[PDB]
Amino acid sequence: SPGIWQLDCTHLEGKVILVAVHVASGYIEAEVIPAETGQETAYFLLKLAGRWPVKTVHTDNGSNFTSTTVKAACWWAGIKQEDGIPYNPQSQGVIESMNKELKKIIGQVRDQAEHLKTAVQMAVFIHNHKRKGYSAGERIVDIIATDIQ
Amino acid sequence: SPGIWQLDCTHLEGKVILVAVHVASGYIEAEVIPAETGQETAYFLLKLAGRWPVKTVHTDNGSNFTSTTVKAACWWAGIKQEDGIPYNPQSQGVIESMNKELKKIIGQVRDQAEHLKTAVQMAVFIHNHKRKGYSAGERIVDIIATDIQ
Ligand SMILES: O=C(O)c1c(CN2C(=O)Cc3cc(Cl)ccc32)ccc2c1OCCO2
Ligand SMILES: O=C(O)c1c(CN2C(=O)Cc3cc(Cl)ccc32)ccc2c1OCCO2
Ligand SMILES: O=C(O)c1c(CN2C(=O)Cc3cc(Cl)ccc32)ccc2c1OCCO2
Ligand SMILES: O=C(O)c1c(CN2C(=O)Cc3cc(Cl)ccc32)ccc2c1OCCO2
Ligand SMILES: O=C(O)c1c(CN2C(=O)Cc3cc(Cl)ccc32)ccc2c1OCCO2
Ligand SMILES: O=C(O)c1c(CN2C(=O)Cc3cc(Cl)ccc32)ccc2c1OCCO2
Structure with a gap:
């Protein structure tokens, strides 16, 4: 639970906002990028995982899920890359x-x-x-600190 | 002490690395920028303070300490802006x-x-x-979580 995050991509003013949500707390980090590419997603995840203990990421789409640059960043950072399919159909x-x-x-x-x-x-x-x-x-701080405190 | 951070600016490859250190833990966040300007420092601080509870920042130099863009970001984000003078002379x-x-x-x-x-x-x-x-x-998570609880 405390290591799980969900990626999410949304559009505004013709730009892309990439968001990572920490699923158990609702805490988020976000960045504006020109367009969602594997390279931008990879670099966003490397930033996130240097700052918080990111064990699993549910990716926002199949392009990122497939991206070799994303998989290389997930490997480097110790992240388990998973799909973001709303298995619980209230996720969408x-x-x-x-x-x-x-x-x-x-x-x-x-x-x-x-x-x-x-x-x-x-x-x-x-x-x-x-x-x-x-x-x-x-x-998020209470959740992660309880995880061995 | 759980809300105290120190800014620090260093140079490499003709670029500037801006660093914020959480004084009590040694945890850091860092970004590369073309040059340290008030605007870049302000934006860095706004990012930091959205992610961690930043109460006080000891600024890295007098230009950032004076910068009205920095002071505006500090006001916006509820940050007490302080000098970073090594009153404890080992700080240098x-x-x-x-x-x-x-x-x-x-x-x-x-x-x-x-x-x-x-x-x-x-x-x-x-x-x-x-x-x-x-x-x-x-x-850092143990420090801030002990403060909450
Ligand atoms: O209020 C919301 O809908 C909200 C939420 C809600 N939220 C939670 O609390 C837990 C959670 C898990 C997931 Cl997978 C997605 C959203 C949320 C999170 C981030 C936000 C939100 O709103 C705007 C900015 O970021
Ligand atoms: O892995 C670490 O050393 C680490 C930790 C260590 N750790 C905990 O205290 C709780 C926890 C849960 C999980 Cl599931 C993985 C690592 C940790 C916390 C925050 C971080 C970390 O490193 C990244 C920056 O934030
Ligand atoms: O070559 C780079 O510096 C770079 C990279 C390079 N690279 C990969 O292709 C896979 C990978 C994993 C990790 Cl862990 C770090 C860098 C890279 C990815 C995204 C970027 C990059 O530069 C700008 C931001 O996006
Ligand atoms: O090993 C170090 O010297 C080091 C440190 C040392 N450090 C602490 O542990 C507490 C602290 C307070 C302050 Cl005001 C500055 C540095 C540190 C912090 C961040 C780093 C470090 O090195 C690598 C990059 O980030
Ligand atoms: O102030 C908050 O709501 C907040 C908090 C709240 N809080 C704590 O639980 C510990 C703490 C110490 C300090 Cl000195 C100020 C606020 C908080 C923690 C992490 C954050 C926060 O918001 C920014 C994201 O990280
Ligand atoms: O106008 C802007 O968008 C901008 C600003 C604008 N602005 C100020 O001048 C003072 C301030 C405080 C805060 Cl809380 C937010 C924005 C600004 C500051 C730094 C930046 C900016 O652009 C991006 C990089 O740095």
Whole structure:
């Protein structure tokens, strides 16, 4: 459980926002890229796995799942690469709802920055700090620290 | 002390590596930028503070300490911006030692990537996972989680 993350890709202003969600807490990291390519996904995962203990990643689509660059990064980083098929058929709805909420947050800060990438990082900040009550950031630290503490 | 971070800026291959260290654990995040400007430092801090609970940052120099773009990001993110003067005079050697170690790691992976930014993120991964027997990544989550609970 504490090592599991889900990748998610969404589009806004003709750019791509790649998101990784820590499935047990709802904590996220996100970046703006020009387009989702295996190389960008690989580098996003290498960043993520240097910062948090990423044991398993459910990939967002079959292109990333197949990408040899992605598989090379997963190998390098000790990550088990898995599919992101909604085996629980409520996973597709959860992912859609997350993107809608993320885009709502982005719209709430959009005017405070020139560049979309800045507004996305403001939106990561607001989501991870939001109380609902613990925040996502509190939950992920409690989850991982319990895992041997 | 669980919210305290130190910024640090080092140079390699004619590029700038900006580093934030979590003082109590030694955990780091790092990025490659063309040059240290207020805008890049501000954006780096906004990313950091969306991901970890950053209460105080000791800035790496007086230009960032003065930068109104940095001060605006610190206000936005709820960060107390402080100087990074080694009032504890060993603090100078500790920072240069960290840079030399980081550049050693980078040299150990440099050949496995075309682009410096990828080698820096590999180095972040290796440092944060290194056992010294707990890792930096383990220490920071234990520090912050003990603070929550
Ligand atoms: O409120 C949401 O819908 C939301 C969520 C909801 N969420 C959880 O709490 C757990 C979880 C697992 C997965 Cl697989 C996807 C989303 C979520 C996560 C991230 C977000 C969200 O909203 C916007 C920004 O990021
Ligand atoms: O206008 C922008 O998008 C931008 C900004 C804009 N801006 C400021 O000038 C002060 C500030 C605080 C915060 Cl919390 C967010 C954005 C900004 C800062 C750094 C950047 C930016 O672009 C991307 C890289 O660095
Ligand atoms: O402030 C939060 O909601 C938060 C927290 C909350 N919190 C803790 O549980 C421990 C802690 C220490 C400090 Cl000194 C400030 C806030 C927190 C932890 C990690 C985060 C957070 O938000 C950013 C993502 O990581
Ligand atoms: O071994 C080191 O010197 C080292 C350190 C040492 N370190 C700690 O453990 C605590 C600490 C506080 C501060 Cl203010 C600076 C460095 C460190 C941190 C990060 C690194 C390091 O080397 C590799 C890259 O990151
Ligand atoms: O050659 C690079 O530096 C690079 C790479 C190189 N590379 C692979 O092709 C597979 C791989 C695994 C890992 Cl663990 C690190 C780098 C690479 C991937 C993504 C990138 C890169 O550069 C920019 C960001 O995206
Ligand atoms: O693997 C580590 O050394 C590590 C850890 C170590 N560890 C824990 O304390 C709990 C845990 C759960 C899992 Cl499932 C894997 C590793 C760890 C935590 C955070 C990190 C780590 O390294 C990456 C940065 O964040």
